Amino acid sequence: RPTFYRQELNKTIWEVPERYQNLSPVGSGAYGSVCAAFDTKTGLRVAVKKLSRPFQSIIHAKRTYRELRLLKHMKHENVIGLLDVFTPARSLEEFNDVYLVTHLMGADLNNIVKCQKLTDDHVQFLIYQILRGLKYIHSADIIHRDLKPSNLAVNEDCELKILDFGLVATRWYRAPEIMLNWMHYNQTVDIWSVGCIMAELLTGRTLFPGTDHIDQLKLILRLVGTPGAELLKKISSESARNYIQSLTQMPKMNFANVFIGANPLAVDLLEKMLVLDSDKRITAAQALAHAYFAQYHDPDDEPVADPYDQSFESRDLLIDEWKSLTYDEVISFVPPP
Numbered sequence: 001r002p003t004f005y006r007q008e009l010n011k012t013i014w015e016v017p018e019r020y021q022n023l024s025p026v027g028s029g030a031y032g033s034v035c036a037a038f039d040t041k042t043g044l045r046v047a048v049k050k051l052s053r054p055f056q057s058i059i060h061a062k063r064t065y066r067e068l069r070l071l072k073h074m075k076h077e078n079v080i081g082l083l084d085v086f087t088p089a090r091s092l093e094e095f096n097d098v099y100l101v102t103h104l105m106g107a108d109l110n111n112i113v114k115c116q117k118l119t120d121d122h123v124q125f126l127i128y129q130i131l132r133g134l135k136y137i138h139s140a141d142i143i144h145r146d147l148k149p150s151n152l153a154v155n156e157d158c159e160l161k162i163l164d165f166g167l168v169a170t171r172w173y174r175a176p177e178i179m180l181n182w183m184h185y186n187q188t189v190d191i192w193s194v195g196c197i198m199a200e201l202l203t204g205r206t207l208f209p210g211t212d213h214i215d216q217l218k219l220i221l222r223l224v225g226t227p228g229a230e231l232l233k234k235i236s237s238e239s240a241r242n243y244i245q246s247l248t249q250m251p252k253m254n255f256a257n258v259f260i261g262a263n264p265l266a267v268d269l270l271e272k273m274l275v276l277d278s279d280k281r282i283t284a285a286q287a288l289a290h291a292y293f294a295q296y297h298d299p300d301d302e303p304v305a306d307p308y309d310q311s312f313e314s315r316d317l318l319i320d321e322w323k324s325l326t327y328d329e330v331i332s333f334v335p336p337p
């Protein structure tokens with residue numbers, strides 16, 4: 001066990017191994033506090049995330065386990081992975097804090113969009129990276145569900161990694177079927193989000209800036225049209241059909257006209273990602289092969305993930321049990337070296 005050192009940063013206590021120096025708060029990492037730091041052992045700048053109240057309730061305990069399991073599984077260039085995981089606790093009974101560390105990226109997609117006009121060439125590279133990461137995540141039967149600019153970390157080399165997977169209004173990038181509360185959505189809910197993100201990078205404005213679930217749905221339908229007959233046939237909810245069918249019917253817009261001066265190849269891809277009926281949307285794998293990514297696409301360098309065991313998701317355990325499982329995972333961790 002390494003030697004730990006304690007300090008206080010913004011009301012939060014940080015007890016980390018001496019190997020990590022110069023901790024500096026950067027922001028909220030979704031249910032956790034994050035500090036940029038220097039890893040004296042590797043010489044790399046890293047981000048360290050301290051989970052907040054990891055075992056406060058059964059929900060928190062299961063979420064803590066879930067996050068650790070997901071991070072230990074992800075080993076891809078465009079997906080946040082783990083360099084180290086630790087706790088200052090010397091025993092299970094004492095175990096009450098979890099710290100996760102990854103390579104520091106330093107910015108998010110929003111820090112690249114605001115008052116900044118990216119070239120079509122840049123959009124190709126950024127979206128290519130998101131899709132390469134999604135192909136990997138999706139191959140593990142994991143759905144991100146909340147893809148947005150703030151969950152896309154980007155470094156100075158314009159390299160990108162997806163963070164907060166499987167765990168700036170969030171509603172703006174949500175698939176319409178989610179706004180409708182459909183419980184049987186598929187992985188293309190993530191493709192919808194990519195489409196909203198790509199459109200935003202090309203235009204400089206949020207594609208669908210809804211003020212609530214209702215407004216969000218309305219803005220989406222104005223562009224992609226209200227449901228056609230084939231899609232309407234798939235809606236089981238009487239209440240959903242009443243609301244949707246009572247709306248003034250709207251045709252799908254042209255897209256070539258909506259996105260006027262954008263690369264026609266980008267418009268074509270946008271049409272395939274933003275198809276209303278989720279069963280007709282392009283997959284991450286198919287998108288990678290689209291002509292828009294010709295200068296980046298390589299089928300031999302777009303890896304799939306090893307199988308991921310999500311069976312625990314259906315289990316109802318006690319807090320102490322989720323805690324013990326998480327402790328087991330912290331101890332069995334083997335760093336990249």
Ligand SMILES: Cc1ccc(C(=O)NCCO)cc1-n1cnc(OCc2ccc(F)cc2F)c(Cl)c1=O
Pocket residue numbers: 026027029034035036047048049071080081082100101102103104105106107108150152153154163
């Ligand atoms: C998205 C962002 C924006 C700006 C800055 C930043 O340094 N700027 C200062 C304030 O904006 C840092 C970040 N930023 C935030 N979280 C990051 O990772 C969180 C994280 C996830 C999993 C782990 F296992 C360990 C972690 F720690 C990274 Cl890897 C990052 O890069």
Ligand SMILES: Fc1ccc(-c2c[nH]nc2-c2ccncc2)cc1
Pocket residue numbers: 176177180182227231234235236244276277278279
């Ligand atoms: F207004 C609507 C109606 C339907 C969708 C929708 C898009 N893809 N799949 C569905 C869907 C919704 C409910 N049940 C089955 C499919 C979205 C918004």
